[PDB]
Coordinates of C-alpha atoms in Angstrom, one line a residue:
Chain A
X1 CA 173.3 79.5 7.6
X2 CA 175.3 80.8 6.3
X3 CA 176.7 83.8 4.4
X4 CA 179.2 83.1 2.0
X5 CA 178.6 81.1 0.3
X6 CA 175.3 81.1 -1.4
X7 CA 171.7 83.0 -1.0
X8 CA 168.4 82.9 -2.6
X9 CA 167.4 84.3 -4.5
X10 CA 168.2 84.4 -8.5
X11 CA 165.1 83.6 -8.8
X12 CA 165.3 81.4 -12.0
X13 CA 163.1 83.2 -14.6
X14 CA 161.2 81.8 -17.6
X15 CA 164.0 81.0 -20.2
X16 CA 167.5 81.3 -18.4
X17 CA 170.0 79.9 -16.4
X18 CA 171.4 80.9 -12.9
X19 CA 175.2 80.4 -13.5
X20 CA 175.4 83.9 -11.4
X21 CA 176.8 85.4 -9.1
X22 CA 179.1 84.1 -6.6
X23 CA 182.6 85.7 -7.4
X24 CA 184.5 83.9 -6.1
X25 CA 184.2 80.9 -4.0
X26 CA 188.3 81.2 -4.3
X27 CA 190.5 79.4 -6.7
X28 CA 192.7 76.7 -4.7
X29 CA 191.6 73.7 -3.3
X30 CA 190.0 69.9 -4.0
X31 CA 187.0 68.5 -1.9
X32 CA 186.3 65.2 -0.9
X33 CA 184.2 64.5 2.9
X34 CA 181.3 66.5 3.7
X35 CA 178.5 67.9 2.9
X36 CA 176.2 70.8 0.8
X37 CA 172.5 71.5 0.4
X38 CA 170.1 73.0 -2.1
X39 CA 166.1 73.2 -2.5
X40 CA 163.3 76.0 -2.5
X41 CA 159.3 76.4 -2.4
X42 CA 157.3 77.2 -5.1
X43 CA 157.5 76.1 -8.8
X44 CA 155.2 76.2 -11.8
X45 CA 155.4 74.0 -14.6
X46 CA 157.8 70.6 -15.3
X47 CA 161.5 69.8 -16.1
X48 CA 164.2 71.8 -14.1
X49 CA 167.7 70.3 -13.8
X50 CA 170.7 72.1 -11.8
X51 CA 174.8 71.3 -12.5
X52 CA 178.2 73.0 -11.6
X53 CA 181.3 73.5 -13.1
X54 CA 184.5 75.4 -12.0
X55 CA 188.1 76.5 -13.7
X56 CA 190.3 79.2 -12.8
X57 CA 188.9 82.5 -12.0
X58 CA 185.9 82.3 -14.9
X59 CA 184.8 79.7 -17.5
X60 CA 184.7 76.6 -18.6
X61 CA 185.7 73.1 -17.5
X62 CA 184.3 69.8 -16.4
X63 CA 180.7 69.5 -14.4
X64 CA 178.8 66.8 -12.5
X65 CA 175.0 68.2 -12.9
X66 CA 171.8 66.5 -11.7
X67 CA 168.3 65.6 -13.1
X68 CA 164.8 66.4 -11.6
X69 CA 161.3 66.9 -12.6
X70 CA 158.4 69.0 -11.5
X71 CA 157.5 69.1 -7.4
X72 CA 158.1 71.6 -4.8
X73 CA 160.6 70.8 -2.0
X74 CA 163.4 68.5 -2.6
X75 CA 167.4 67.9 -2.1
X76 CA 170.1 65.6 -3.4
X77 CA 173.6 65.4 -2.2
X78 CA 177.6 66.4 -2.6
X79 CA 180.2 66.2 -5.1
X80 CA 183.5 64.7 -6.3
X81 CA 186.6 66.0 -7.2
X82 CA 186.8 69.4 -8.5
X83 CA 189.4 72.2 -8.8
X84 CA 188.0 75.3 -7.7
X85 CA 185.4 78.0 -8.7
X86 CA 182.0 76.0 -8.6
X87 CA 179.7 78.7 -10.7
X88 CA 177.1 76.5 -9.7
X89 CA 174.0 76.1 -9.8
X90 CA 173.4 76.4 -13.5
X91 CA 170.0 75.3 -13.6
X92 CA 167.4 75.0 -16.5
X93 CA 165.0 74.9 -18.7
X94 CA 161.8 75.4 -20.5
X95 CA 158.2 75.8 -19.5
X96 CA 156.6 79.0 -17.7
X97 CA 158.2 79.7 -14.1
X98 CA 159.5 82.5 -12.3
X99 CA 160.4 82.1 -8.7
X100 CA 163.0 80.8 -6.4
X101 CA 166.0 78.5 -6.6
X102 CA 168.2 77.3 -3.3
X103 CA 171.0 77.5 -1.6
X104 CA 174.0 75.8 -0.2
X105 CA 175.1 74.2 3.4
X106 CA 174.5 71.9 6.8
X107 CA 171.5 69.9 7.0
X108 CA 168.7 69.8 6.9
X109 CA 166.7 66.5 6.9
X110 CA 163.2 65.8 8.2
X111 CA 160.6 65.2 11.3
Chain B
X1 CA 173.7 84.4 -4.4
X2 CA 177.3 85.3 -2.2
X3 CA 178.7 87.7 -4.5
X4 CA 182.3 87.6 -2.8
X5 CA 185.9 85.7 -2.9
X6 CA 185.3 84.7 0.9
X7 CA 187.1 87.0 3.6
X8 CA 187.0 85.5 6.9
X9 CA 186.7 81.8 7.8
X10 CA 183.9 80.2 6.3
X11 CA 182.9 76.6 7.6
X12 CA 184.9 74.9 5.1
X13 CA 187.8 75.5 7.0
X14 CA 186.2 74.3 10.5
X15 CA 184.7 71.4 8.7
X16 CA 188.7 70.7 7.1
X17 CA 190.5 71.0 10.1
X18 CA 187.8 69.4 11.7
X19 CA 187.4 67.4 14.8
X20 CA 186.5 63.5 14.9
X21 CA 187.1 60.9 17.4
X22 CA 186.5 64.0 19.7
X23 CA 188.6 65.7 19.9
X24 CA 191.0 68.7 20.8
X25 CA 193.9 69.6 18.1
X26 CA 195.3 67.7 14.9
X27 CA 197.8 65.0 16.1
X28 CA 200.7 67.8 16.2
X29 CA 199.6 69.0 13.9
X30 CA 198.6 69.6 10.3
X31 CA 202.1 69.8 8.3
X32 CA 203.5 70.5 4.8
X33 CA 203.7 72.9 2.1
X34 CA 205.6 76.0 2.6
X35 CA 209.0 76.4 1.9
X36 CA 211.8 77.1 4.1
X37 CA 214.3 80.2 4.6
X38 CA 217.1 81.6 7.0
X39 CA 217.9 84.9 8.1
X40 CA 218.1 84.5 11.1
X41 CA 219.7 87.9 11.1
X42 CA 220.9 90.7 13.4
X43 CA 219.1 93.5 14.3
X44 CA 219.6 97.2 15.4
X45 CA 217.6 100.3 16.4
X46 CA 218.9 103.1 14.5
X47 CA 219.4 106.9 15.5
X48 CA 217.5 108.6 15.1
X49 CA 213.9 108.3 14.9
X50 CA 214.5 107.0 11.4
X51 CA 217.2 107.2 8.5
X52 CA 220.5 106.3 10.2
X53 CA 223.0 108.7 8.5
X54 CA 226.5 107.7 8.3
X55 CA 228.8 109.0 5.5
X56 CA 231.1 107.3 3.5
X57 CA 233.4 109.5 1.3
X58 CA 233.5 110.2 -2.3
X59 CA 237.1 110.1 -3.4
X60 CA 239.9 111.7 -1.7
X61 CA 242.3 113.9 -4.3
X62 CA 244.8 114.9 -4.9
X63 CA 248.4 116.1 -4.1
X64 CA 250.8 117.0 -6.7
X65 CA 254.4 117.6 -7.3
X66 CA 255.9 120.6 -5.9
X67 CA 258.6 122.3 -8.0
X68 CA 260.7 123.9 -5.6
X69 CA 258.2 127.1 -4.7
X70 CA 254.8 127.7 -6.1
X71 CA 252.2 125.1 -6.4
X72 CA 250.1 123.8 -3.2
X73 CA 246.7 125.4 -2.4
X74 CA 244.7 124.4 0.1
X75 CA 243.2 120.5 -0.3
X76 CA 239.8 119.6 1.2
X77 CA 237.9 116.0 1.7
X78 CA 234.4 115.6 1.3
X79 CA 231.9 113.4 2.3
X80 CA 228.1 112.8 1.8
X81 CA 224.9 111.6 4.2
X82 CA 223.4 108.3 3.4
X83 CA 220.8 106.1 5.5
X84 CA 217.5 105.0 4.2
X85 CA 213.9 104.4 5.4
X86 CA 211.5 101.2 6.2
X87 CA 208.2 100.3 6.8
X88 CA 206.0 98.0 8.9
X89 CA 203.5 95.4 7.8
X90 CA 200.7 93.2 9.3
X91 CA 197.6 91.3 8.8
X92 CA 194.7 90.4 11.3
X93 CA 192.4 87.5 11.8
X94 CA 188.9 87.2 12.5
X95 CA 186.5 84.2 13.4
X96 CA 182.6 84.1 14.7
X97 CA 182.4 83.8 18.6
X98 CA 179.5 81.3 18.0
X99 CA 181.2 79.1 15.0
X100 CA 184.8 78.7 16.7
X101 CA 182.6 77.3 19.5
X102 CA 180.7 74.4 17.4
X103 CA 182.1 72.4 17.7
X104 CA 183.4 73.3 21.4
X105 CA 187.3 75.0 22.3
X106 CA 188.4 77.3 20.4
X107 CA 192.3 77.5 21.7
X108 CA 193.8 75.0 19.3
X109 CA 191.7 76.6 16.4
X110 CA 193.2 79.9 17.3
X111 CA 196.8 78.6 17.9
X112 CA 196.4 77.1 14.4
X113 CA 195.6 80.1 13.1
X114 CA 199.0 82.0 14.4
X115 CA 201.0 79.2 13.6
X116 CA 200.0 79.2 9.9
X117 CA 200.1 82.8 9.6
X118 CA 203.4 82.6 11.3
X119 CA 205.2 80.7 8.3
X120 CA 203.3 82.6 5.5
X121 CA 204.5 86.0 7.0
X122 CA 208.3 84.6 6.8
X123 CA 207.8 83.4 3.7
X124 CA 206.3 86.7 2.4
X125 CA 209.1 88.7 4.4
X126 CA 212.2 86.8 2.6
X127 CA 210.0 87.0 -0.5
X128 CA 210.5 90.5 -0.7
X129 CA 214.1 90.9 1.4
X130 CA 215.7 90.6 -2.1
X131 CA 213.1 91.9 -4.8
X132 CA 211.0 95.0 -5.1
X133 CA 211.7 98.9 -4.7
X134 CA 209.5 100.8 -7.3
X135 CA 206.2 100.5 -5.2
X136 CA 204.7 102.2 -2.3
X137 CA 207.7 101.6 -0.3
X138 CA 209.1 99.0 2.1
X139 CA 211.7 98.7 0.7
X140 CA 214.9 97.9 -1.1
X141 CA 217.5 95.3 -2.0
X142 CA 218.2 94.9 -5.7
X143 CA 220.2 98.1 -6.0
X144 CA 223.3 96.1 -7.2
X145 CA 221.5 95.8 -11.1
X146 CA 222.9 97.4 -13.4
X147 CA 225.9 94.9 -15.5
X148 CA 228.9 97.4 -15.9
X149 CA 230.4 100.2 -14.0
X150 CA 231.0 103.6 -14.5
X151 CA 226.7 103.9 -14.7
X152 CA 226.8 103.2 -11.3
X153 CA 229.4 101.3 -8.6
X154 CA 228.3 97.9 -9.2
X155 CA 231.5 96.4 -10.5
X156 CA 233.7 94.9 -8.0
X157 CA 230.8 93.6 -5.8
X158 CA 228.9 91.6 -8.7
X159 CA 231.7 89.2 -9.9
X160 CA 229.0 88.3 -12.1
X161 CA 228.9 85.8 -15.3
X162 CA 228.0 85.6 -18.9
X163 CA 225.2 83.8 -21.1
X164 CA 221.1 84.4 -20.9
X165 CA 219.5 86.6 -23.4
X166 CA 219.2 90.3 -24.4
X167 CA 215.7 89.4 -25.9
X168 CA 214.5 86.4 -23.8
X169 CA 214.3 86.9 -19.9
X170 CA 214.5 82.8 -19.4
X171 CA 215.8 81.7 -16.9
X172 CA 218.8 81.3 -15.0
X173 CA 218.6 81.8 -11.1
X174 CA 221.0 83.8 -9.0
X175 CA 223.2 83.2 -6.0
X176 CA 224.1 86.0 -3.2
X177 CA 226.7 86.0 -0.4
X178 CA 227.3 88.9 1.9
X179 CA 228.6 89.6 5.5
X180 CA 226.2 90.4 8.7
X181 CA 227.2 93.4 11.0
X182 CA 225.9 95.4 7.7
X183 CA 222.8 95.3 9.8
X184 CA 219.2 95.3 9.4
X185 CA 217.1 98.4 11.4
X186 CA 214.1 98.6 13.0
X187 CA 212.3 101.3 14.8
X188 CA 212.0 101.3 18.4
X189 CA 210.0 98.3 19.4
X190 CA 210.6 94.6 19.5
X191 CA 212.3 92.6 16.8
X192 CA 209.8 90.7 14.4
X193 CA 206.4 89.1 14.4
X194 CA 205.7 89.7 18.1
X195 CA 201.8 88.4 18.1
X196 CA 201.6 88.0 20.5
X197 CA 198.3 89.7 21.7
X198 CA 194.7 89.1 22.5
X199 CA 191.3 90.6 21.8
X200 CA 187.4 89.7 22.4
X201 CA 185.0 92.3 21.1
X202 CA 182.3 93.1 18.7
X203 CA 182.5 93.8 14.4
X204 CA 183.3 95.3 12.3
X205 CA 181.4 93.5 9.9
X206 CA 179.4 94.1 6.4
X207 CA 181.2 96.8 4.3
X208 CA 179.8 99.7 1.8
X209 CA 178.8 101.0 4.2
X210 CA 177.6 98.5 5.2
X211 CA 173.6 98.8 6.2
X212 CA 174.4 97.9 9.5
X213 CA 177.1 95.1 10.8
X214 CA 177.2 94.4 14.6
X215 CA 178.4 91.0 15.7
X216 CA 180.9 89.6 18.3
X217 CA 183.9 88.2 17.7
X218 CA 187.3 86.7 18.8
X219 CA 190.5 88.2 17.0
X220 CA 193.9 89.3 17.0
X221 CA 196.9 90.5 14.6
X222 CA 200.7 90.1 14.0
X223 CA 202.7 93.3 13.2
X224 CA 206.3 93.4 11.7
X225 CA 208.6 96.2 11.2
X226 CA 212.4 96.0 9.7
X227 CA 214.4 97.6 7.2
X228 CA 217.9 96.3 5.7
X229 CA 221.0 98.5 5.9
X230 CA 223.6 98.7 3.4
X231 CA 226.1 100.7 5.9
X232 CA 228.8 99.8 2.8
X233 CA 228.5 98.8 -0.9
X234 CA 231.3 95.9 -0.7
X235 CA 231.3 92.7 1.3
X236 CA 228.3 91.5 -1.0
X237 CA 228.3 89.1 -4.0
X238 CA 226.0 88.2 -7.2
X239 CA 226.2 86.4 -9.8
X240 CA 224.3 85.5 -13.0
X241 CA 225.1 81.8 -14.0
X242 CA 223.6 79.0 -15.8
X243 CA 221.1 78.3 -17.3
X244 CA 219.7 74.9 -17.0
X245 CA 221.0 73.9 -20.6
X246 CA 224.7 74.5 -19.2
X247 CA 223.3 73.7 -15.6
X248 CA 222.6 70.2 -17.1
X249 CA 226.1 70.1 -19.5
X250 CA 228.2 70.9 -16.4
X251 CA 227.9 67.4 -14.7
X252 CA 231.7 67.0 -14.6
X253 CA 231.9 69.0 -17.8
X254 CA 233.4 72.6 -18.2
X255 CA 232.0 75.1 -20.8
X256 CA 229.8 77.2 -18.2
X257 CA 230.8 76.4 -14.6
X258 CA 230.8 77.4 -11.2
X259 CA 234.3 79.1 -10.7
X260 CA 232.6 82.2 -9.7
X261 CA 232.3 80.4 -6.3
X262 CA 236.3 81.6 -5.8
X263 CA 236.2 84.7 -7.5
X264 CA 233.4 86.5 -5.4
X265 CA 234.9 85.5 -2.1
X266 CA 238.6 87.2 -3.1
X267 CA 236.7 90.3 -4.0
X268 CA 236.4 91.5 -0.6
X269 CA 238.9 93.0 2.0
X270 CA 240.4 97.0 2.0
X271 CA 239.8 97.5 5.0
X272 CA 236.7 98.3 6.2
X273 CA 237.6 95.4 8.3
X274 CA 233.9 94.5 9.7
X275 CA 233.2 92.5 11.6
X276 CA 232.6 89.0 12.8
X277 CA 230.6 86.8 10.3
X278 CA 230.0 86.0 6.7
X279 CA 227.9 83.0 5.0
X280 CA 226.8 81.8 1.3
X281 CA 223.0 81.9 0.2
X282 CA 222.0 79.1 -2.2
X283 CA 218.4 78.7 -3.6
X284 CA 218.4 75.0 -3.5
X285 CA 218.8 73.5 -6.8
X286 CA 222.1 75.2 -7.1
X287 CA 222.9 73.8 -3.7
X288 CA 222.5 69.9 -4.7
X289 CA 223.9 71.0 -7.9
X290 CA 227.0 72.3 -6.8
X291 CA 227.6 69.3 -4.6
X292 CA 226.9 66.7 -7.4
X293 CA 229.3 68.6 -9.7
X294 CA 231.8 69.3 -7.0
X295 CA 232.5 65.7 -6.3
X296 CA 233.9 65.0 -9.3
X297 CA 236.7 67.5 -9.5
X298 CA 239.6 65.9 -11.2
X299 CA 241.9 67.8 -9.0
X300 CA 241.6 68.2 -4.7
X301 CA 239.6 65.2 -3.4
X302 CA 240.2 61.5 -3.6
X303 CA 238.1 60.9 -0.1
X304 CA 238.1 57.8 1.7
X305 CA 235.7 55.2 2.2
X306 CA 233.3 56.9 1.1
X307 CA 231.4 59.4 -0.8
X308 CA 229.5 61.6 -1.6
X309 CA 230.7 64.6 0.5
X310 CA 228.7 65.1 3.8
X311 CA 226.9 68.1 2.5
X312 CA 229.1 71.4 1.9
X313 CA 229.0 73.4 5.0
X314 CA 232.0 74.6 4.3
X315 CA 234.3 76.4 1.8
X316 CA 236.4 78.3 3.0
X317 CA 235.4 77.8 5.7
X318 CA 232.5 80.5 6.2
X319 CA 229.4 78.6 6.8
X320 CA 226.9 78.6 4.0
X321 CA 223.0 78.3 4.6
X322 CA 220.3 77.8 2.0
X323 CA 217.2 79.9 1.5
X324 CA 214.4 80.8 -1.1
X325 CA 215.5 82.5 -4.4
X326 CA 214.1 82.1 -7.6
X327 CA 214.8 80.2 -11.0
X328 CA 214.0 83.4 -13.2
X329 CA 215.1 86.9 -13.3
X330 CA 217.2 88.6 -15.6
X331 CA 220.4 89.2 -17.4
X332 CA 222.8 92.4 -16.1
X333 CA 226.2 91.0 -15.2
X334 CA 229.9 91.6 -16.0
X335 CA 229.5 93.8 -19.2
Chain C
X1 CA 203.8 106.5 4.4
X2 CA 201.0 107.4 4.5
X3 CA 197.3 108.0 4.3
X4 CA 196.3 111.7 5.0
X5 CA 197.6 112.8 3.1
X6 CA 196.7 111.7 -0.5
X7 CA 197.7 108.3 -2.9
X8 CA 197.9 107.4 -6.4
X9 CA 195.7 107.7 -8.6
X10 CA 194.9 111.2 -10.0
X11 CA 195.8 110.3 -12.3
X12 CA 197.3 111.0 -15.9
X13 CA 195.2 110.7 -19.2
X14 CA 195.8 111.6 -22.7
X15 CA 195.2 115.3 -21.4
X16 CA 194.7 116.4 -18.0
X17 CA 194.2 119.2 -15.4
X18 CA 195.8 119.0 -12.2
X19 CA 193.9 120.6 -9.5
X20 CA 192.5 117.5 -8.1
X21 CA 192.8 116.3 -5.2
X22 CA 192.4 115.2 -1.5
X23 CA 191.2 117.5 1.2
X24 CA 191.7 117.3 4.1
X25 CA 195.0 119.1 3.8
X26 CA 193.9 121.6 6.5
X27 CA 193.7 125.4 6.9
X28 CA 195.7 126.7 9.6
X29 CA 199.6 126.2 10.1
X30 CA 202.9 127.5 9.3
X31 CA 206.3 125.5 9.2
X32 CA 210.0 125.5 9.1
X33 CA 211.9 122.2 9.2
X34 CA 211.4 118.8 7.7
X35 CA 210.5 116.6 4.7
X36 CA 207.9 115.6 1.6
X37 CA 208.4 113.6 -1.1
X38 CA 206.8 112.3 -4.6
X39 CA 207.6 109.8 -7.2
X40 CA 205.7 107.3 -9.0
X41 CA 206.5 104.7 -12.1
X42 CA 206.2 105.2 -16.0
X43 CA 206.3 108.6 -17.8
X44 CA 206.2 108.9 -21.7
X45 CA 207.2 112.5 -23.1
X46 CA 208.4 115.6 -22.3
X47 CA 206.2 118.4 -20.4
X48 CA 205.0 118.1 -16.9
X49 CA 205.0 120.5 -13.5
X50 CA 203.6 120.2 -10.1
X51 CA 202.8 123.0 -8.1
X52 CA 201.1 123.9 -4.5
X53 CA 198.5 126.4 -3.2
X54 CA 196.8 127.7 -0.1
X55 CA 193.8 129.3 1.2
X56 CA 190.5 128.1 2.4
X57 CA 188.6 125.8 0.7
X58 CA 188.9 127.1 -2.8
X59 CA 191.0 130.1 -4.4
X60 CA 193.5 131.0 -5.5
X61 CA 196.8 132.2 -4.5
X62 CA 200.6 131.5 -4.0
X63 CA 203.2 128.7 -5.5
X64 CA 206.2 127.0 -5.1
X65 CA 206.3 124.8 -8.2
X66 CA 208.7 122.4 -9.9
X67 CA 209.3 121.0 -13.5
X68 CA 210.6 117.9 -15.0
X69 CA 211.1 115.9 -18.6
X70 CA 210.2 112.7 -19.0
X71 CA 212.0 109.2 -16.9
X72 CA 210.7 106.4 -14.8
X73 CA 210.9 107.3 -11.1
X74 CA 212.0 111.2 -9.8
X75 CA 211.6 113.4 -6.8
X76 CA 212.1 116.6 -5.8
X77 CA 211.6 117.5 -1.7
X78 CA 210.1 119.5 0.9
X79 CA 207.6 122.5 1.2
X80 CA 208.5 126.0 2.4
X81 CA 206.2 128.2 4.5
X82 CA 202.5 128.5 3.3
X83 CA 199.3 130.1 3.8
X84 CA 197.4 126.9 4.4
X85 CA 195.7 124.7 2.3
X86 CA 198.0 122.9 0.0
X87 CA 195.9 121.8 -2.9
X88 CA 199.2 120.8 -4.4
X89 CA 199.9 118.8 -6.1
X90 CA 198.8 120.6 -9.3
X91 CA 200.2 118.8 -12.4
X92 CA 200.1 119.6 -16.1
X93 CA 200.3 119.1 -19.2
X94 CA 200.1 117.4 -22.3
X95 CA 201.4 113.8 -23.6
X96 CA 199.4 111.0 -23.3
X97 CA 200.6 108.5 -21.1
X98 CA 198.2 106.6 -18.5
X99 CA 200.8 106.0 -15.8
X100 CA 199.4 106.5 -12.5
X101 CA 200.3 109.6 -10.6
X102 CA 202.2 110.3 -7.2
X103 CA 202.1 110.8 -3.4
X104 CA 203.9 112.5 -0.7
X105 CA 205.3 112.1 2.9
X106 CA 208.1 110.9 4.7
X107 CA 211.3 109.8 2.8
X108 CA 213.2 107.7 2.1
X109 CA 216.0 108.0 -0.4
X110 CA 217.9 106.0 -2.8
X111 CA 220.5 103.3 -0.7
Chain D
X1 CA 241.3 96.5 -26.5
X2 CA 244.0 94.7 -24.9
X3 CA 244.9 96.2 -22.2
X4 CA 246.2 92.9 -20.7
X5 CA 247.5 93.8 -17.2
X6 CA 250.8 92.0 -15.8
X7 CA 252.6 91.0 -12.8
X8 CA 256.0 91.9 -11.3
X9 CA 258.3 90.6 -8.5
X10 CA 261.5 92.2 -7.2
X11 CA 263.6 92.1 -3.9
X12 CA 264.1 95.1 -1.4
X13 CA 267.4 96.3 -0.8
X14 CA 267.6 97.7 -4.3
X15 CA 266.2 100.4 -2.0
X16 CA 264.3 103.6 -2.0
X17 CA 266.2 106.8 -2.0
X18 CA 265.5 110.1 0.0
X19 CA 267.4 113.6 -0.2
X20 CA 269.6 113.5 3.0
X21 CA 266.9 114.2 5.6
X22 CA 263.7 112.4 6.5
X23 CA 261.6 109.7 5.3
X24 CA 258.0 108.7 4.7
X25 CA 255.1 111.0 4.9
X26 CA 256.2 113.1 7.9
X27 CA 254.1 115.8 9.4
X28 CA 252.5 116.7 11.7
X29 CA 253.1 120.4 11.8
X30 CA 250.3 123.1 12.8
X31 CA 251.0 126.5 13.7
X32 CA 248.2 129.0 13.6
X33 CA 247.8 132.2 11.6
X34 CA 245.5 134.2 9.1
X35 CA 244.7 134.2 5.7
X36 CA 245.2 134.8 2.5
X37 CA 242.1 134.6 0.1
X38 CA 241.1 133.9 -3.1
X39 CA 242.8 134.4 -6.5
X40 CA 243.5 138.1 -8.0
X41 CA 244.1 139.2 -5.6
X42 CA 241.8 138.5 -3.9
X43 CA 240.6 140.5 -1.0
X44 CA 242.0 141.8 2.3
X45 CA 242.2 138.5 4.3
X46 CA 243.6 138.0 7.7
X47 CA 241.5 135.5 9.5
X48 CA 242.8 133.2 12.2
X49 CA 242.9 129.5 11.0
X50 CA 244.1 125.7 12.0
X51 CA 247.2 125.1 9.1
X52 CA 249.0 121.7 8.5
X53 CA 251.2 119.8 5.6
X54 CA 252.1 116.5 5.1
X55 CA 255.2 116.3 2.9
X56 CA 256.9 113.1 1.2

């Protein structure tokens, strides 16, 4: 769950970001209450970090972003005020990895 | 990764409308931002299956002075058919039978959907009641546009104003008023909205083309058909007015004023008697402005205790209501 | 009004043919009564002409035709008896003008 | 380019004269007979018709 929005994969290769592709998450709204999500499985090496941005239909304005290091399986949390476009995610960066990104919507959790 | 501008209600909707401490609906209900309009009109079905014919005439000339014997010749009055077309328009909504049931009971959900769709619908119908007509049909109004006569009929029905600019289309709104009984025609089914129906079946899903689809849903739609009449070019009034420079200057002053408010009223009667009611239209802003400026007339007033004049609903009297026009159009007036 | 038959665009480039487009228009019938239509937006200069035709699928006979000069919005009227196919319209010829094209079916006149 | 209009007012009793026989718009007369044609001279003619006139 669920189609519209995001789906895996991208697949976050060696050397590029993953701002693609979702057009559009629509261009009018604001956001403050409920949840989101993001995670995937196999990685390769070292430091990665996602982000988000938005504007009117294209690019480019403010962000929120986050930071993480190497491990397999994770997840953080939500977002504060935004206009609306959410080009996220926008992952990075270096080393040599070629597999699988994430997707967003409800939990989740562990057992 | 998702690709599309979201048709259908993603969970974002069901989680914003939501339900907390239970429950069923939103404390009756959700409110707010959509403007309001009148019309609130009169409707008629029209012979035949479309059109509506009618005729009017184009001049009735001319008798000549008989000089005791010779000149007469037969004389002949002519006419011409007229009436125009119309068209339908509608949407439809979809849900997913599953998500609308998580959480429970979709009845409130769908009711919210039809009410919102209704307000947006009327908004659009009034939005195109005044503008358009050069695209893929329904319908036509604006056809009073040209400023002076001889290039059309315009003139007397236009009353008009001055100012604006020939190289800058900013901004100055406009005011209308005309009489009902010059009806709005509809094809042979009920009047407006009527929706008002129910369906529960299966998708209808994934497009192009679309490597399958198939899921069950709970859905329906709302259609509308209408088409105004002209019936007669007259008993109608247009203006150009301000703009906001003079519109502010007119606090009580007199350079570019509201005087046309009377001229238009007096530009009618032949007759051509028809038929029972008349009404003046404003776009808000000019409404309040007209009130505030009309209070300070150095002449007829003096009131009692006390101001500020209990709205406007008279003059003279022909009750006036409010619609939603816009604050920016184009010139085209008197000459 | 209406789908089946054809819609704009076709269209009109700096130079175009006109034989296109849209079958179905169907190959059996005769006719003696009512209406048709054709207009669109922003012309440019001078020479233009629509036409008709009829057969089964292809070639190559008959006409009715019309001719216009440059203006924004126009129209003629309805058809006559026919073999049966109406590849029409069949525009032409010069000018430049990327301007969209036209359509047909019931009308619908000016006020 | 004026072109300026005007307004009038007088009184009735300074009448409107008509020639020693009826008044205003009269007729109201019908009959029924033949043509007549176009000009010069023009053709045979003769065809029953509906006729009427109004004089003033």
